[PDB]
Symmetry: D2
Subunit: 331 residues, 4 copies
Amino acid sequence: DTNIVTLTRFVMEEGRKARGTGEMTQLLNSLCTAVKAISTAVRKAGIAHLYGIAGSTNVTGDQVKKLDVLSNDLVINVLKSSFATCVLVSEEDKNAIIVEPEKRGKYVVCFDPLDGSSNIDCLVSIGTIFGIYRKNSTDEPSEKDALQPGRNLVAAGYALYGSATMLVLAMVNGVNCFMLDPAIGEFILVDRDVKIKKKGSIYSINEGYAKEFDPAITEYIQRKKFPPDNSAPYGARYVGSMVADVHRTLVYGGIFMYPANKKSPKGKLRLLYECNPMAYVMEKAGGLATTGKEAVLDIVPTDIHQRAPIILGSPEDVTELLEIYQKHAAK
Amino acid sequence: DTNIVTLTRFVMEEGRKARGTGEMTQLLNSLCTAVKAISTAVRKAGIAHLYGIAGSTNVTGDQVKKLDVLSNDLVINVLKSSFATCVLVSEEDKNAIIVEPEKRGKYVVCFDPLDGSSNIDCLVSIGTIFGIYRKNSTDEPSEKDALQPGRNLVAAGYALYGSATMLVLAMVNGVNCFMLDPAIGEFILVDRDVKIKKKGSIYSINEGYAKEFDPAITEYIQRKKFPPDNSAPYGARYVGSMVADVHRTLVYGGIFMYPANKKSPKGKLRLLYECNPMAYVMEKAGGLATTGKEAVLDIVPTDIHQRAPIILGSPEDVTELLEIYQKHAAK
Amino acid sequence: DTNIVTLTRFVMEEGRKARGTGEMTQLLNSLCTAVKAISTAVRKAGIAHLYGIAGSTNVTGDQVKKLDVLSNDLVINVLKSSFATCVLVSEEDKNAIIVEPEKRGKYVVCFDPLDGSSNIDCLVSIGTIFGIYRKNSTDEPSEKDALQPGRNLVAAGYALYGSATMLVLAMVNGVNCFMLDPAIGEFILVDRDVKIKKKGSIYSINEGYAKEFDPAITEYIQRKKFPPDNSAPYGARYVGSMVADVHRTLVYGGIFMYPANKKSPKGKLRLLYECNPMAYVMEKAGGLATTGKEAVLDIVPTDIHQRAPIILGSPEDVTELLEIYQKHAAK
Amino acid sequence: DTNIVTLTRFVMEEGRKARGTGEMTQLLNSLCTAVKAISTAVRKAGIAHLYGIAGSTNVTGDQVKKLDVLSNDLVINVLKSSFATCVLVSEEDKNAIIVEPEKRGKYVVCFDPLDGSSNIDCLVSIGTIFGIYRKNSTDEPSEKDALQPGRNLVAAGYALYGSATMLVLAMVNGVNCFMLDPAIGEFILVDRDVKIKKKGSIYSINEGYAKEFDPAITEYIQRKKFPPDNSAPYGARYVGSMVADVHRTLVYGGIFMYPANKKSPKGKLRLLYECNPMAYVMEKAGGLATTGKEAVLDIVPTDIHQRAPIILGSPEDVTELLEIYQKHAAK
Ligand SMILES: O=P(O)(O)OC[C@H]1O[C@](O)(CO)[C@@H](O)[C@@H]1O
Ligand SMILES: O=P(O)(O)OC[C@H]1O[C@](O)(CO)[C@@H](O)[C@@H]1O
Ligand SMILES: O=P(O)(O)OC[C@H]1O[C@](O)(CO)[C@@H](O)[C@@H]1O
Ligand SMILES: O=P(O)(O)OC[C@H]1O[C@](O)(CO)[C@@H](O)[C@@H]1O
Ligand SMILES: [Mg+2]
Ligand SMILES: [Mg+2]
Ligand SMILES: [Mg+2]
Ligand SMILES: [Mg+2]
Ligand SMILES: [Mg+2]
Ligand SMILES: [Mg+2]
Ligand SMILES: [Mg+2]
Ligand SMILES: [Mg+2]
């Protein structure tokens, strides 16, 4: 127990290959500090009276909670002091944040400081989602720098504050899970090179929107309940926090869906800091992530708070759904 | 912050009324120690390699996990040393456990050492469920002592290992929530005299069993999706761990269902250590808990591992469902 | 690791012999909560800005620190809610505290909320010292109830906030050490039936008072440095916190001295909540504790803040010193 | 509380001036992980049965304890994976450790994995001491690289596992203290640019060696007890762990002494990983550190396990002692 393989040691060794400026490690180390702070607050929110609203609404119209503010501040602050970022996109901020010249690095980070707001009060799993982009342009940093398609992601992942706190990280060569050791405050590698099953037996969606589902989702769900080949029906699971449902999909396999509907042409989840990071993790894990008409990572954003339909998980499950959408594709 | 209202102080003061032998406090204090031990292990299970099966099956046919064993042992051991119990019923033990004479107390405790096994590996919320019965008979303690209807419960509750660890406790006069303070290892009162909303807007059930649902559940679910009065459709939520889904139902209101079906006349959840404790908490919170034909707490068990259909939550939501069952009631 | 032997389980089993009202266990459990709270604050005092004075002076003329207040409040509050005490004597309170009728128990507790004030800022070991007396009289509880000689102690001990937090407890039959497990917030038995060595090789005293030492101490110290039989000279150790120096004396053996001097006829340490508890622990461990003229536990106090000279530790070391005092005894 | 100033952020900003390869930060971050691991083990050593010997002796003849091994391994391992060191000198290792080519950095680190062994069992303050040297030569790394005088130190400091865990760090421009926040596992700046008082009122030495003291120490101590100007005599303090006694000297001022004696021409404490780091911290804090004949940092080592007499602390106190040595200086 004297050779603890931390996220820092892990990243440094992998990055030892290309050998860069080393700010990605600074980026992640900074992010890990924020995640530990969030994990500690969430673990005792009730006692610290951290539940409740903050008395404000975000650009996407959500009722800002106190933990939204706290988590957002923690992440903003640590990312700035990392000397690794220049542009920051947060769900909680109307416009992109531009890092002061002195603390500027070459990365653009889009993040959801706290995902799963409806589940804060009921102690259900919540988390933090992030996507790292390397700044390509040469002109002054700005919002445009965060408007890159998910294919350009260099690193993505999420922190899961569940029965245990986990930091799932995906990079060019794969996905790794690190668990937070409460005693020494370190994320330790517990899962190496994670790969999602080709086909699962769990479908995850909010069926409360059945009246708005398009004929494709409606048919897919009916198929998971009444299999045509008389195979065992899929089990259903919907925690309510994207980070939780996606993580389960990653380790148990299956499918998670937050499609578009009669009232939401572009679904609900945000593309920059929700859809893209998960699509990226999913694809680096051998999975798929589609809107139902196109790969999520190939969408070229025009609004940092843009919404996108997302269907992701095991390739065979996602493909079965795409085939149905194609079957219903109209003029 | 120098007057910490712990579960111990709370119980002692309430019990200061009747003023008994004081072993209920010993019971709960002992239970709190086990819950803290479970919380700590779960928080770092991956790092401690606590995931995986234990290589055994319980009386109910589940694949025993390593945490099942650990949690079960911790609870068995602390309950024995409390000098407050005589008969113990655990999901993990084939037969009732009889406490040696020297350490015997007047309570019978039925418990689910670790609830939500399918969600262990994906870090989804899990917990511990318990029900305390006072031994009434005078003859040697035995299994029969655990075969009392839920109406006889003196105390019930559950530990929720979610984004935060909470100990929900219900007694004759009401329900209170205590949150575990990781720093000093104490459960502190965060929610006093909890009452569930008369009507919610969330339904919780595994729709993957649609092909087996009886006409009553089928109709109820269709109604939550396509309201006849054109009101907003209910939102759906199903974490997969009874403790998590029930807790959310308790604080957000709504309905949780694990009904009987074409293949499971008595549903799945166990009556002694799953259904009864939750039915009790639910009723002390002003909620309802039915099988769809009778109150859960009024069932007289004949098998400590007996299963029971359970529908619980907001009184108006549960009642709307009972009315439907009554509408379908056949000869 | 599923059978954790806590201080609570330990006390309950030992007390299972006589079998009393059970409030001693309530007393100790309450005290353990306060000690964990103090341990957590001290562990992060600098970060919580808990260092510094509180802007007040106690009856003994010390400059009250912020941790003095905090620790004092925590202990006062938990002892009151334990329903086990009636009179309380604290170093920080001018007069004895009388527990309101409703929360009254049969015990009198004298305590030093935080011992070793000079070592707070330098992060040197500090602690908490307590002495429990059973109320014998029948009239209204009052200060007089705390004016009993140490021989009347029913329980005594101290919490040591050092490299690790330890709770040393002595009762009629012996001494046991319990270590605080930070992860689950429980004191676990690590040392059973502790006995001090008959003779040590360490002397502990503040030699900065050499100019005031009486001929007895002066001669004793010279003897520890220049042994007459040419044996190895004693090693010297003086941490500055009674709890630390006494604990070391208990586990390594030797002698600790805070004698009277030309300017302090009654030494410095307080008899009620400093000298007596340690003398008691020391004697139950097979050690001795004298003023240099009489056993510390046999002094009948007349002032709850009374001071007393104290020399304690290994019987042979203490006796060698008594012989010297007797050699110098004058008309 | 959303802008936590950690040791990492602190070092990075200061180093932002010169702007180097950035491995010093990697060095320190790696070291901080080891220190947190040691702090956690020490906090629960008794419970983890970490007390006792390891069944071996070091080059300096000490009886190796289990924590010596653990701490040594943790430090060796993290320093290697930091990609910042090439030569390592540990009290526990007979010869210098040469870092494999792949993980080599430009720093040489001399360290005492666990200081204060005699105080392990009695829960008295213990710590970790380190000294960082930049490799100057160009030939293959070797032991010679660790044989530099303390004046060549680039960074030095120590971890103090006391009532709180503190990381004291000194660099070219000054000394800063960082306290470990147990909740998030981070060292936070609590003391900025620490400066020692010009004169103190506490002397720290093991007077048990009085029979071996040279006439200089003997006279100095007598002077601290019987001041010639009738000023208040100095208070005495000797915890037994260099890290603890030195830290107190740093924050309270005064003097700490472990001089040479009739049997130990070169005192006891080791120059490479004990004397130099403390002399460096002391001097960067405006203090002094002498052998009694020459500055400690100016000694050119010839043996990595070389011993050295050390007298350090407030400049006026140390100078008063040097004057006495000069008064006794013989042919
Ligand atoms: O309540 P709904 O509409 O199912 O939305 C739940 C989804 O919204 C979010 O809370 C938005 O952050 C996701 O975490 C989650 O997947
Ligand atoms: O996978 P299913 O059939 O929905 O069962 C889930 C239910 O079973 C349990 O895991 C049994 O403990 C409950 O915690 C949960 O509510
Ligand atoms: O500084 P002095 O006079 O040696 O006093 C130290 C003694 O005083 C106290 O700080 C009083 O609480 C003891 O803990 C300690 O033994
Ligand atoms: O027992 P002695 O000879 O006073 O030695 C104590 C000194 O030795 C050490 O334990 C050696 O590490 C120091 O920490 C301490 O200052
Ligand atoms: Mg969010
Ligand atoms: Mg979100
Ligand atoms: Mg279970
Ligand atoms: Mg269960
Ligand atoms: Mg005190
Ligand atoms: Mg004291
Ligand atoms: Mg050492
Ligand atoms: Mg040392």
